[PDB]
Design a binder for this molecule. Structure first.
Ligand code: PP4
Ligand code: PP4
Ligand code: MAN
Ligand code: MAN
Ligand code: MAN
Ligand code: MAN
Lengths: 323, 323
């Protein structure tokens, strides 16, 4: 049976986490994203100017083209990408998926043209939301799932330190205590789960649902919760230049926690200080608005505090504090 | 209980079929498409130059915006469209869906900018393939399905004559004999079905699967079948200006038929003559290649010969020769 460990590394301010992935013999640095189901990469089909500062996949060398197939994806921040499709060998942490569908980019929006830290995204949400037309493809995980020792993957994202993606096994040395599991609603293709309640510093409130999403940097919550949280931060104010609420970097931030099937997941205030706002001398808050979409996004700010197991059996998510 | 009848009308050469749909009090002419799951319309959000020669939806007047929601779709011919989302009242043939998600176009590719015959598309494939992010919406049919007398719709597309879309009931006067049903595989979101065999003129061959797709003008089949068919047409030759095989307009074309759960669906040779190729004095064939995608597209050329029932119970498709 198979299993493997892929090491991830955060970019400046933990804005994103990259992990090497070898496709058809070429190694690219991809952003693993549990919030989407497409594996797409910068390729030789892009204009040469857009290939600069990236490792690119050349489909002609090793891929098998799916004639007539296309893909087109649009993300939460409005970014987008589209292209054609090939199958090829894809290796991650020593685990190889043969015949994996690789989505070669032909067009990418400005956000991606500006980000030279990654060469594409590897989706780990459920395959039901893969965008390939006319017939959707399976994610790397769904492709290899049956070959793994256990049909799950786990992740430990860290603050300014390398972390890991464990495929097909759980590394108990990565967390304290035992794991607590909760049921996943995969109906919209996400690793969605419910929280029973939350505590923002001195204020507690009713539960809500949200998605475990490695692809989003911040912890995005309803406007009412964000207000409650920042009302407790002296001098907090919104700064559109920075992207949300900002505050003096030395401010003492309250903790934030959620109750999940009896387990209290706590994000300490120190992790809620994302980093310099870029806006002179303030810091950007790790908690920001979800724009009224009706569910919360448990992004990297939250994930940095926990070891999280994504188990296809159930499905269900397991949580424990990182070691 | 509800039911209704919407009249469709073919454009020149039966290239597409339009049907009026009233959204928030404004009537638009839409192309009903059983091959996709999005209801999208030309809107006031498009550049004014692109609104010309169309009836447009103004979301601000009656729609409720789903903040943070987007849609982006890519079709078989490579065309595409994208925009934002609103809920509104949508009436088709006297049947009203309240709170139906209407996808307002913000960008559309050249194919749509050139086609002034329609103001958008109304998808009737399964809702599982609807493109709305972050949470997909239901098609008009799935929205109203529970209110209908029977959870089905039926269609009779005609050659140069008005036809109908029957919602929630079957009009037995539209076909000869009794209906034959066959099981539908909705796993890729299409009204997919299997045929046991086919007969192209003097040649017969093994079965294959395909989708019932009102949104595609032609009958698209595997290259091997297309070759077999045209090898029997004197003087047939490909003409890229025209889009495929063309032949002298007076040529006697062989029939084409498929066996489906014991029923023989026959497309007479006269319907296989699509119309002038635009390429001087030849006619375009109604049968053309599917580009190697692995399944056939039973488009309008085929549908013009049958009354077809799309039944959500099963699901299953019913067929009988048009009356
Ligand atoms: C269709 O669902 C998505 O796009 C999922 C889920 C989702 C849905 C709605 C709102 C937020 C997130 O996001 P993702 O796949 O993790 C998606 C992945 C993504 C998108 C653009 C990128 C641009 C450059 C580099 C990495 C990128 C990663 N991240 C984001 O869109 C967010 N960006 C950052 O936090 C916005 C929320 C702030
Ligand atoms: C994602 O699936 C589709 O796009 C489905 C199914 C499909 C898949 C693969 C190949 C062909 C068809 O096609 P549709 O929704 O019926 C799709 C609907 C469609 C697309 C563009 C249009 C542009 C102008 C006006 C009407 C349009 C209708 N039609 C077509 O793309 C075809 N166009 C014509 O036959 C190409 C095949 C010739
Ligand atoms: C992950 O687990 C597999 C299956 O037990 C091992 O073979 C591998 O070495 C790694 O420990
Ligand atoms: C990535 O690198 C980490 C340490 O930097 C290892 O723990 C892991 O096995 C992988 O090689
Ligand atoms: C369609 O069927 C409904 C339900 O029987 C009728 O009320 C309607 O008039 C139409 O015949
Ligand atoms: C559309 O028009 C047809 C005839 O043109 C009617 O049969 C149908 O009821 C609808 O009014």
């Amino acid at each position: 049976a198979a299993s493997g460990v892929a090491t991830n590394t955060p970019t400046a301010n933990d804005e994103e986490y990259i992990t090497p992935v070898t496709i058809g013999g070429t190694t690219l640095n991809l952003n693993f994203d549990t919030g989407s189901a497409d594996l797409w990469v910068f390729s030789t089909e892009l204009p040469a100017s857009q290939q600069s500062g990236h490792s690119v996949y050349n489909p002609s060398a090793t891929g098998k083209e799916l004639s007539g197939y296309t893909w087109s994806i649009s993300y939460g921040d409005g970014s987008s990408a589209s292209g054609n499709v090939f199958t090829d060998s894809v290796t991650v942490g020593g685990v190889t998926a043969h015949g994996q569908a690789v989505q070669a980019a032909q067009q990418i929006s400005a956000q991606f043209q500006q980000d030279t830290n990654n060469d594409g995204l590897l989706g780990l949400a459920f395959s039901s939301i893969n965008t390939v037309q006319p017939q959707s493809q399976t994610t790397f995980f769904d492709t290899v799932k049956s070959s793994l020792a256990q049909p799950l993957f786990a992740v430990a994202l860290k603050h300014q330190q390398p972390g890991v993606y464990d495929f097909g096994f759980i590394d108990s040395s990565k967390y304290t205590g035992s794991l607590t599991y909760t049921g996943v609603d995969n109906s919209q293709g996400f690793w969605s789960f419910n929280v029973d309640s939350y505590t923002a510093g001195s204020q507690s409130g009713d539960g809500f649902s949200g998605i475990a999403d490695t692809g989003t940097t911040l912890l995005l919550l309803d406007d009412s919760v964000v207000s409650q949280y920042y009302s407790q931060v002296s001098g907090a104010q919104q700064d559109s230049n920075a992207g949300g609420y900002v505050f003096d970097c030395s401010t003492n931030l309250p903790d934030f926690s959620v109750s999940i099937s009896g387990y209290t997941a706590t994000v300490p205030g120190s992790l809620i200080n994302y980093g310099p706002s870029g806006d002179g001398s303030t810091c950007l808050g790790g908690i920001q608005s979800n724009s009224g979409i009706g569910f919360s996004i448990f992004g990297d700010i939250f994930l940095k505090s926990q070891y999280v197991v994504f188990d296809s059996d159930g499905p269900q998510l397991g949580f424990a504090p990182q070691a």
